[PDB]
Design a binder for this molecule. Structure first.
Ligand code: NDP
Ligand code: NDP
Lengths: 254, 254
């Protein structure tokens, strides 16, 4: 089967690892990030490793509603189908209960949560046409346990888990699965940030972070991509509405 | 103790029942709804029953940010304190995954979820001054199990549960409790609506609704107010960050 997968925010980190892995598994790829050079560099990496691969680059801000429509129109025109969606867009600027404001909170809501929901809407239309879809929402662990320095991102994570569940029920009769993948601590540029964004006090801030992880280490982007890829496979046909963490045991709650 | 309680959306339904009950328990009351005549009628009811009561009416749209600031400035000026907040504002227009749009979803987010969070921010400032607060968020059961015809309201409920938890951790050292009260099916004008808003097919639509309730009946506004009032009492000083349903057993999930 020649399945087609759309992976956004794929120029680095979790998105890039998912792209490389889906390529290794012979998916036709549509890939996206904002920076054109950086996402092109990924298509090169894939081609270099898989010269016979099919990879289409659609750069652009996936948080922007009109861009989203445009990227999905291009997908339908140039692909004719869509089998897999990887929803992967960063949350908003960190905020707290004390400093949150309606403007920033509104922007955070629209830029991740609304974007995912809209992307699912447009992806699912294509997916229904061939009665097959796999949707993996990259969300996060703040959804169950917030979240002091991520006040709005935590509540938006909870919203997204709740919406994905709802959507999964609606899309299930069409053989479209909808699952959430919640990374814990994964070594990307966003985590290497955190190691500093907290160093605010004193590299051995990571020994501190790793302590709270039962596995006692930060996970790799590929460890996260292994889960995404399994969820995207045809054999994961009876798994939907799930929230699955790749967090080395970090969630102490069932 | 002469505690002061602010109850919004108090002109009918759950809010009105909470107001009457807090009055029976000798709280000083600030009460609000949009319709001036209707909320005044409630102050009359209270006075008629408790001639020596203290009841201040502050009409206005609590979803409106500037009104909120104004109502809270009036509370600080005319009350000098605030001990109890009852967050009680309806959700947005019902929507579905299929018909949801960024405009309406944004309005729903701002009108309930942001409003509660902002109200908590302004109420907590007053509460900190006397090291006592009780905050009861009237939310809903759609937060754990959505929610087909309430797509955005369900995810906003999940957001609110997540935010309340976060806030409860922050406000706990100040002896301010923060709990969510999730009504299931409660006989108000909003439910009597639903009995029709679903009659779309065929009063015996209620026999249908009641079937899904283990107690086999819809609850009363006073049954809901009994829980709110207990949470608002001084003796509930060690209960915070809770989500408690008054739903006749309707939640089948733990
Ligand atoms: N510990 C962790 O890594 C955790 C990660 N997550 C979540 O996992 C997801 C990915 O995380 P992570 O790998 O660390 O992210 P990264 O910051 O490492 O990279 C994000 C990628 O997305 C691209 N991107 C950013 N904004 C947009 C946009 N508006 N439209 C399209 N592409 C965009 C970036 O490229 P470019 O700038 O070129 O657009 C970049 O390639 C995020 O949603 C994050 O919230 C959740 C919890 C923990
Ligand atoms: N089965 C049920 O009743 C359920 C209820 N809930 C929740 O419980 C809460 C109360 O429900 P319910 O009693 O049925 O609501 P009602 O529709 O019966 O009444 C709501 C009250 O709030 C007032 N109000 C509405 N909008 C505003 C506003 N923007 N600012 C200030 N006041 C307002 C209304 O008066 P006025 O128009 O004069 O302003 C009215 O008095 C809601 O948040 C609802 O979401 C959740 C699940 C189930």
């Amino acid at each position: 089967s020649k399945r087609t997968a759309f992976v956004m925010g794929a120029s680095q980190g979790i998105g890039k690892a998912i792209a490389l892995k889906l390529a290794d598994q012979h998916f036709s790829l549509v890939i996206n990030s904002r920076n054109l050079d950086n996402i092109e560099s990924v298509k090169e990496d894939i081609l270099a490793k898989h010269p016979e691969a099919s990879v289409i680059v659609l750069a652009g801000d996936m948080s922007d509603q009109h861009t989203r429509a445009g990227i999905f129109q291009k997908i339908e025109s140039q692909c004719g189908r869509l089998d897999v969606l990887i929803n992967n867009i960063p949350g908003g600027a960190p905020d707290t209960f004390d400093n949150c404001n309606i403007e920033d909170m509104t922007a955070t809501f629209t830029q991740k949560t609304v974007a995912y929901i809209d992307a699912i809407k447009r992806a699912s239309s294509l997916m229904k046409q061939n009665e097959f879809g796999r949707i993996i929402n990259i969300v996060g662990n703040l959804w169950k346990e917030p979240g002091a320095n991520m006040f709005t991102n935590s509540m938006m994570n909870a919203a997204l888990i709740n919406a994905s569940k709802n959507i999964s029920i609606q899309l299930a009769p069409h053989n479209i699965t909808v699952n959430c993948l919640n990374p814990g601590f994964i070594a990307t540029d966003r985590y290497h940030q955190f190691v500093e964004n907290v160093m605010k006090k004193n590299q051995k801030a990571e020994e501190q972070i790793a302590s709270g992880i039962p596995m006692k280490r930060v996970g790799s982007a590929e460890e996260t991509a292994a889960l995404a890829a399994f969820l995207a496979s045809e054999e994961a046909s009876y798994i939907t509405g799930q929230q699955i963490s790749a967090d080395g045991g970090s969630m102490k709650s069932i």
